[PDB]
Amino acid sequence: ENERNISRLWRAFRTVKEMVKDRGYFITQEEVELPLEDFKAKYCDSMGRPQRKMMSFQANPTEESISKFPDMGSLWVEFCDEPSVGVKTMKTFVIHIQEKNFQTGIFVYQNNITPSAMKLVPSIPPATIETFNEAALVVNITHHELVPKHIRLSSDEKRELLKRYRLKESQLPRIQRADPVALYLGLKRGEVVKIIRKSETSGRYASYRICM
């Protein structure tokens, strides 16, 4: 029953763009809004089975992104057609990134990864790699009502914060680097995020967290 697989893939595939948009790169609003059929039209051949490879794409920062985060470079999005993630598949994708010189790759596996390839995830600093389960992305979490808005901050902004409260970086409330939201934002350690909390007592209420 490809239908769910198609739907779920499309459904998860939506979340990705949502993330990449939210993460600050440039994606047209309608590219987020792609309906299932056009998704099938575009990304499915005449099979019933879409092609992961035609789905993978490059993303680029927006102006404000670049202006605010000068160090932000190009993003590559990648899907793994094979369920298994080959160390060579990794090696293929990994070198593929460095060859084309992406700031960051994103590699969405279907089910499982060779932990040997996991060792090869920190292969080519500064460039970094992010790996998500296709099934993990079925629903964008940031859309859930409990999840407040999250905003990654410029190093400048982070300074202004600390200098305002006169803190050492580690005295902030921590956010685990393995937190799905951090994962969703792709936070480096030592990055600080603004969290807008909607109080029932007060109104919108800003708070902060530092990624470790």
Binding site for another protein (CB under 8 A): 4, 8, 22, 122, 125, 135-136, 138-151, 165-176, 179-182, 189-190, 194-209, 212
We find the least distance from the C-beta atom of residue 139 to another protein, in angstroms, to be: 4
Q: Is residue 127 within 8 Å of residue 103, measured between CB atoms? A: yes
We find the least distance from the C-beta atom of residue 40 to another protein, in angstroms, to be: 18
We find the least distance from the C-beta atom of residue 201 to another protein, in angstroms, to be: 5
How far is residue 87 CA from its own chain's centroid?
Answer: 22
Q: What is the DSSP letter of 44?
A: B
Between residues 66 and 162, which has the closer beta carbon with respect to another protein? 162
Between residues 42 and 174, which has the closer beta carbon with respect to another protein? 174
| Edge-to-edge strand list for the sheet holding 25-26 | 25-26, 57-61, 75-79, 104-109, 128-133
Look-up of token digits 């970086």? 169
Between residues 46 and 168, which has the closer beta carbon with respect to another protein? 168
Between residues 58 and 207, which has the closer beta carbon with respect to another protein? 207
What is the amino acid identity at position 121?
V
Furthest-apart CA atoms within the chain: distance in Å: 61
The tokens describing 58, both together, are: 């490059």
